[PDB]
Design an enzyme around this catalytic site. Structure first.
Site, PDB file in Angstrom:
ATOM      1  N   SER A 194      39.804 -28.775 -15.299  1.00  0.00           N
ATOM      2  CA  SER A 194      39.866 -30.559 -15.404  1.00  0.00           C
ATOM      3  C   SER A 194      39.079 -31.155 -14.939  1.00  0.00           C
ATOM      4  CB  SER A 194      40.980 -30.568 -14.335  1.00  0.00           C
ATOM      5  OG  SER A 194      41.639 -31.191 -13.780  1.00  0.00           O
TER       6      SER A 194
ATOM      7  N   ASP B 193      41.932 -27.212 -19.310  1.00  0.00           N
ATOM      8  CA  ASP B 193      43.132 -28.542 -19.101  1.00  0.00           C
ATOM      9  C   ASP B 193      42.059 -29.368 -18.771  1.00  0.00           C
ATOM     10  OD1 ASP B 193      45.757 -28.528 -19.153  1.00  0.00           O
ATOM     11  OD2 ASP B 193      46.356 -28.056 -17.390  1.00  0.00           O
TER      12      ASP B 193
ATOM     13  N   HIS C  92      49.235 -26.531 -14.558  1.00  0.00           N
ATOM     14  CA  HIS C  92      47.255 -28.022 -13.663  1.00  0.00           C
ATOM     15  C   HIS C  92      46.873 -26.262 -12.880  1.00  0.00           C
ATOM     16  CE1 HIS C  92      43.873 -30.448 -14.857  1.00  0.00           C
ATOM     17  NE2 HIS C  92      44.433 -30.399 -13.509  1.00  0.00           N
TER      18      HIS C  92
END
Ligand SMILES: CC(C)(C)[C@@H]1CC(=O)N(CCOc2ccc(F)c(C#N)c2)C1
Ligand SMILES: [Cl-]
Ligand SMILES: [Cl-]
Length: 371
Positions: A219, A242, A297
């Site tokens: 992320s 991600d 996620h």
């Protein structure tokens, strides 16, 4: 339970802080270990990280003591301060954590890489994107273990653009510095760990394959991967788990010479983020993307394993896919990718099909339409 590595090596783990300042490096090291009779590593090792996570989840500060009660005695299956397996030079992964996270929360990934023969350095960022982190104000304070804690910064709407970019650039510098540190330690530069732990850093002397370096992260750490690659050519490829692309400047997209692999969740991604990923593409350059079916996620981080199926799905920590199946796919694809682009002589090419999204639980490229 956080799953054990699938590879042939036993796994060890320790912490390194050097220097002691909030400009120094702080990292959790995962490495192939010689010994397997040590205690397992405490997963979230200080109360203040729980306080931190409370602030991140934007709940009553009291929720920190609940999270501590539930999770504060949990371990991850790596031998704490186990000696390093000698007699081989290990490729190095630098790992960047997400926003609201910190260095310890990607052990599933760290442990599995280590079990296949990587040293992994999971950095703890001091950009105030971590839920918490700590340092020492001076040498006396380090000596007695007198910790000074630095918590997540909450931003106003109009600071978002500017500060996230400031942060992602601080993150890349911290990945570079962490690299330089491990490389100095490989060359045998005596380092005094500000944490007073029973793990001799000279074990690492001549243990790093100095050419074979990669950067991986989740992320905000996925963006960190990309910024780091553009700033530091010592990193030879990167894997973005991600990735959150928002923090990156418009300038970086065309400035990534190294092979780069996007591994996405099914439910996190969205056109704005994918379009940004697609700006990294160029036919002269090497780029891959896969999407893990039924995944969320949080499948990339350790909390996907800390609760039961039902409560996990409730809190969006788990997806439709089994969390172990999910992380196996991400880890195995990463390994194939690493073997190819770092030029390793292992058997990770067995998972080359995964890089191309050729699996019942994989989508080649993305499910997101952007045309
Ligand atoms: C996309 C955003 C919502 C803006 C962020 C950007 C980002 O980086 N995100 C990922 C955080 O991941 C974590 C956090 C805390 C944890 F405790 C864990 C765990 N385990 C994972 C999500
Ligand atoms: Cl999601
Ligand atoms: Cl969008």
């Amino acid at each position: 339970k956080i799953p054990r590595g699938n590879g042939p090596y036993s796994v060890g783990c320790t912490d390194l802080m050097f220097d002691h300042t909030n400009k120094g490096t702080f990292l959790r090291l995962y490495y192939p270990s010689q010994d397997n009779d040590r205690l397992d590593t405490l997963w979230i090792p200080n109360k203040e990280y729980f306080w931190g996570l409370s602030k991140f989840l934007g709940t009553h500060w009291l929720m920190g003591n609940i999270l501590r009660l539930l999770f504060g005695s949990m371990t991850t299956p790596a031998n704490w301060n186990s000696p390093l397996r000698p007699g081989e030079k290990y490729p190095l992964v630098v790992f960047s954590h997400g926003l609201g996270a910190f260095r310890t929360l990607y052990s599933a990934i760290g442990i599995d890489l280590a079990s296949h023969g990587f040293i992994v350095a999971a950095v703890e960022h001091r950009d105030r994107s971590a839920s918490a982190t700590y340092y020492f104000k001076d040498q006396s304070a380090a000596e007695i273990g007198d910790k000074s804690w630095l918590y997540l910064r909450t931003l106003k709407q109009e600071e978002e653009t500017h500060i996230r970019n400031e942060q992602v650039r601080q993150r890349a510098k911290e990945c570079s510095q962490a690299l330089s540190l491990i490389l100095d330690i490989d060359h045998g530069k005596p380092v005094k760990n500000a944490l007073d732990l029973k793990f001799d850093m000279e074990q690492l002397k001549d243990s790093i394959d100095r050419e074979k370096i990669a950067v991986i992260g989740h992320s905000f750490g996925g963006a960190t991967v990309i910024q780091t690659l553009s700033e530091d050519q010592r990193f030879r490829c990167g894997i973005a788990l991600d990735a959150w692309m928002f923090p990156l400047g418009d300038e970086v997209y065309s400035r990534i010479p190294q092979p780069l692999f996007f591994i996405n969740s099914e439910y996190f991604q969205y056109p704005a983020n994918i379009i940004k990923m697609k700006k990294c593409y160029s036919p002269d350059k090497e780029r891959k993307m896969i999407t893990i079916r039924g995944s969320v996620h949080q499948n990339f981080a350790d909390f996907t394993f800390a609760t039961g199926k039902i409560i996990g799905h409730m809190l969006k920590l788990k997806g439709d896919i089994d969390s172990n199946v999910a992380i196996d796919l991400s880890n195995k694809a990463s390994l194939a990718f690493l073997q190819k682009h770092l030029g390793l002589h292992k058997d990770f090419d067995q998972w080359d099909c995964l890089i191309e999204g050729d699996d019942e639980n994989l989508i080649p490229g993305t499910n997101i339409n952007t045309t």
